Task: inverse folding
RNA sequence: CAAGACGGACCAGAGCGAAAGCAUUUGCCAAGAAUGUUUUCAUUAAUCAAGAACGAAAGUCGGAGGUUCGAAGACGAUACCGUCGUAGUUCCGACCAUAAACGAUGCCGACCGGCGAUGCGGCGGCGUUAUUCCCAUGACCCGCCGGGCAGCUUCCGGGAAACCAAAGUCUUUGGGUUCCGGGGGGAGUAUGGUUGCAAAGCUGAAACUUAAAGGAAUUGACGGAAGGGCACCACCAGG
């Protein structure tokens, strides 16, 4: 839709990105 | 340096007595300072009022132009000047696969009001018609134009403006054209789309009293 | 100044919104058409010439004329939208819509809306040539 | 297609065709007896007549010319020939 | 109470009928307005009722129906309901240069492009919505977005090839 | 005839003891009212009259109540047409045709074929043997 | 109120005309195609050298009018654009005779597949409409015939192919006839002739120069361009 496009351009993408970094006996 | 609107005043303008709504509005008039007369500013005031502002249950696309020439002290008097149709009605009324037939006459009434009458008519698609287009041939267009010219002439030439405008409120002339031109080509929605004040005789007071009762 | 009309009943002015391609004229006048209440255009409000025909300028001019008529006593208004017409474009643009929206927010009640843009039967040549356009 | 007796076409197909495009061409017209209502004489009238045929005894209009077949007036009777 | 009527041409009666549900619902639940469509006059009439919310939005509701009359999808006209800075601009192709016959049709095809692609591209470039009638063209968007879309459309009907307008409008959107 | 927001909850269907039915589709309501069993609705009161549209075939004379189907069941042609029906509580049904020759005519039905979703619906309803614009193309 | 302009929408797979072209009403004038025809004449026909008539726009001579637009031109900004604006655009009478004046596609005749749309004329028919109109007529509906404008479909055949129901009936080559082309440039140029007030129109070379010029469709590389993913040998905050 038009308003969805306008609000997607008005907001910032976020969400998923897997960043792989980095006892008993 | 000073507001001009304090010197102004207000005149209440109302329609002739045949309309069930009495008051049609208020008008700003300058006051008399001796150089010019306040009644002289109302000798030719032209008002545009839709018919739905003049009747309750009737249609709105028809509008009347009224001439104003008299005032009697916070009582304003108007007179007929012509009519028109709303532009959106005319624009929605011109469809595609059908013929538009236009006619006009210059006719004199019983009391000297020389009028110019316009008529526009459109052809019907039948209730079982399968062809996309419903066109009238040129000779049939000529008979329709002659018929509606002579019908409006015979309806307004020997008639007085009281019953002329009482025909104009429900557009009985359109019903007459729709009934009478049916035997040539079925018309769809015919209207007297314009009445023009061509010539106006000498002004008299008692007739506007009969307009206003 | 309170034109001797009670509470419920109202006086109808008529507003001509000349939405041109350079600015917007919001012109309010009496129902006859001769006596005019106030005429405030887009260039009377904004300072530059970029935004003479902007919707914001038309909005602010509509606010101005609405306030001017409300301090007089006119609450009801008829509307005559009017593009530059003639040979040119024949549809009221965003300025007229902005003026109508602003006059709606101001408390003004709308009467009859009608386009009064001058459509010719068939007029003369346009300001363009055989090839020219806007841009 | 590819098998049809051109010598012996079906009669409805021959009547369907144009009058010149038949196997042997023939007219679509006929002559007819016309009996005026005000008399009892017989008038021989062409179906596609172009002139206003008048009664020999009554001097009344029998047919009106048209683009195609002639239009007989109301009240007169007609019978085809041959 | 205020009322406003919207005409419906004969080519828009079936689209109006088919998705009438998602047309009358967003007016009666959100703006609290009271609507109908008469077949004798072929007019969609909107008027305010007692349980009206934000009376100075009635015009917006009318704009809703108006956009759907011009050929816009109901999602874009519902965006016209939601956003306040959304406007409508209409003009003819011959209204800026006289094109007759096949030249007019070629100008229409240049605005549309193959599969509508060029037209669609301009939309995603300008965040607008364009529906073009037989000779009319209508743009729905904010003011500067309307100006950019009008710029691209006017350049395409000048005779500039769609490739150059494509590249230039992408570069202008980048700015 | 006006539509208010107060009537939106009221407008569900045609609105007029121990056990009832919450059926919605017209087929089950039709057979229940044919049997005389009292059918109920989302509202408190029962249904007295039930009117709707079905698809009747004019080739093999078989009716189908599926409003989305376009081919017939027995003959299998694209030959179903809209015919209205109305039933009551007593078990009496009356079903209305249309005596309009526009619906039943073979006008746009014959055209030569080439050798071998809901958008663009009105373009198909035009007959192929007609004037389209010279620089437009049907696929 | 006046002045000249122009006839929107309706306006189309439409109609008319030899083409160029043609759209406000009414009246007058004389033409015209198709249709219908158990009329008349009896080969009176087809094509074009010479020759003649018309021929968009611009342009040239004289009269009238100049609304809008507007070559040249004067200003302002940056060949593009804006303001003003001359000739012209308009009418009348003579010249000019040129256009992508296109179907980039002689004219007449015959044969060779299908479909249903449309314009006109004719014919046949259940039926509905002029508030169940009391027979006819106009408006629709179905079907047929003839000449048209124009589509869709086809392994008819043809073609270099795009495609064409003609651009088919062509090495199985002959229905009649007019104009016209012979690799690309020089060059539609020079000169001569002819027409024109002029601009120019019609006819029109050679010397020389060159191995190409061009047509039909199809993609594949082709710096690159628009979306994403990842990375402390990329970055933010840092050490
Ligand atoms: Zn069946």
Result:
């Amino acid at each position: 839709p038009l308003a969805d496009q306008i609000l997607a351009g008005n907001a910032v993408r976020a969400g998923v990105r897997e960043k792989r970094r980095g006892e008993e006996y | 340096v000073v507001d001009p609107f304090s010197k102004k005043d207000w005149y209440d303008v109302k329609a002739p007595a045949m309309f069930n709504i009495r008051n049609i509005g208020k008008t700003l008039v300058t006051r008399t300072q001796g150089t010019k007369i306040a009644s002289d500013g109302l000798k030719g005031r032209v008002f545009e009022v839709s018919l739905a502002d003049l009747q309750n249950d009737e249609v709105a696309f028809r509008k009347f132009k009224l001439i104003t020439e008299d005032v009697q002290g916070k009582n304003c008097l108007t007179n007929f000047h012509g009519m028109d149709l709303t532009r959106d009605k005319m624009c929605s009324m011109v469809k595609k696969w059908q013929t538009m037939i236009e006619a006009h006459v210059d006719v004199k009434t019983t009391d000297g009001y020389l009028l110019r009458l316009f008529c526009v008519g459109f052809t019907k698609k039948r209730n079982n018609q399968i062809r996309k287009t419903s066109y009238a041939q040129h000779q049939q267009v000529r008979q329709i134009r002659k018929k509606m010219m002579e019908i409006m002439t015979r309806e307004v030439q020997t008639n007085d403006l009281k019953e002329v405008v009482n025909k104009l409120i429900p557009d009985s002339i359109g019903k007459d054209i729709e009934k009478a031109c049916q035997s040539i080509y079925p018309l769809h929605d015919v209207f007297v789309r314009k009445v023009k004040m061509l010539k106006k005789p000498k002004f008299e007071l008692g007739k506007l009293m009969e307009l206003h009762g | 100044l309170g034109p001797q009309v009670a509470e419920g009943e109202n006086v109808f002015g008529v507003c001509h919104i000349f939405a041109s391609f350079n600015d917007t004229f919001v012109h309010v006048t009496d129902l006859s058409g001769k006596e005019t209440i106030c005429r405030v255009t887009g260039g009377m409000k904004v300072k530059a010439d970029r935004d003479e025909s902007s919707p914001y300028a038309a909005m602010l001019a509509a606010q101005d004329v609405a306030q001017r008529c409300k301090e007089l006593g006119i609450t009801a208004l008829h509307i005559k939208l009017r593009a530059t017409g003639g040979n040119r474009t024949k549809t009221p643009g965003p300025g007229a819509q902005s003026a109508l929206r602003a006059l709606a927010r101001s408390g003004m009640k709308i009467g009859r809306i009608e386009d009064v843009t001058p459509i010719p039967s068939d007029s003369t040549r346009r300001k363009g040539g055989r090839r020219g356009r806007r841009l | 297609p590819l098998a049809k007796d051109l010598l012996h076409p079906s009669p409805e197909e021959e009547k369907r065709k144009h009058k010149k495009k038949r196997l042997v061409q023939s007219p679509n017209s006929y002559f007819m007896d016309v009996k005026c209502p005000g008399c009892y004489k017989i008038t021989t009238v062409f179906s596609h007549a172009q002139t206003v045929v008048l009664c020999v005894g009554c001097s009344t209009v029998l047919c009106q010319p048209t683009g195609g077949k002639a239009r007989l007036t109301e009240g007169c009777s007609f019978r085809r020939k041959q | 109470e205020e009322t406003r009527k919207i005409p419906v041409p004969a080519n828009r009666y079936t689209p109006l009928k088919e998705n009438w549900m998602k047309i009358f619902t967003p007016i009666v639940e959100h703006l609290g307005l009271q609507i109908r469509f008469n077949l004798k006059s072929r007019n969609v009439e909107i008027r305010t009722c007692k349980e009206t919310k934000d009376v100075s939005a009635l015009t917006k509701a009318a704009d809703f129906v108006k956009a759907f009359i011009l050929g816009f999808q109901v999602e874009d006209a519902l965006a016209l309901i939601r956003l306040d800075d959304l406007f409508l601009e209409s003009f003819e192709i011959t209204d800026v240069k006289p094109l007759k016959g096949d030249h007019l049709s070629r100008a229409i095809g240049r605005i549309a492009g193959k599969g509508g692609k060029t037209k669609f591209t301009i939309e995603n470039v300008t965040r607008t919505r364009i529906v073009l009638a037989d000779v009319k063209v209508h743009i729905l968007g904010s003011f500067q977005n309307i100006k950019m879309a009008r710029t691209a459309i006017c350049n395409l009907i000048l005779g500039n090839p769609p490739s150059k307008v494509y590249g230039n409008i992408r570069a202008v959107a980048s700015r | 005839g006006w539509i208010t927001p107060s009537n939106i909850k009221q407008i569900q269907q045609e609105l007029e003891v121990r056990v009832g039915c919450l059926t919605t589709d017209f087929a089950m309501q039709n057979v229940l009212l044919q049997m005389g069993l009292h059918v109920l609705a989302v509202n408190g009161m029962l249904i007295r009259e039930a009117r709707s549209y079905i698809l009747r075939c004019h080739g093999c004379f078989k009716t189908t109540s599926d409003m989305s189907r376009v081919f017939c069941s027995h003959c299998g042609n694209k030959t179903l047409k809209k015919v209205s029906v109305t039933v009551s509580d007593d078990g009496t049904l009356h079903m209305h045709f249309s005596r309009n020759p526009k619906v039943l005519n073979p006008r746009g039905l014959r055209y030569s074929l080439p050798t071998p979703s809901t958008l663009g619906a009105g373009r198909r309803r035009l007959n192929p043997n007609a004037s389209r614009k010279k620089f437009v193309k049907k696929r």
Summary: The interface with chain B takes residues 100-102, 105, 107, 130-131 of chain F (CB under 8 Å). The pocket of zinc ion is lined by residues F 57, 59-60, 62, 72, 74-75, 79 (CB under 6 Å). Residues 99, 101-102, 105, 107-108, 110-115, 127-134, 138 of chain F lie near RNA strand G (CB under 10 Å from a C1').
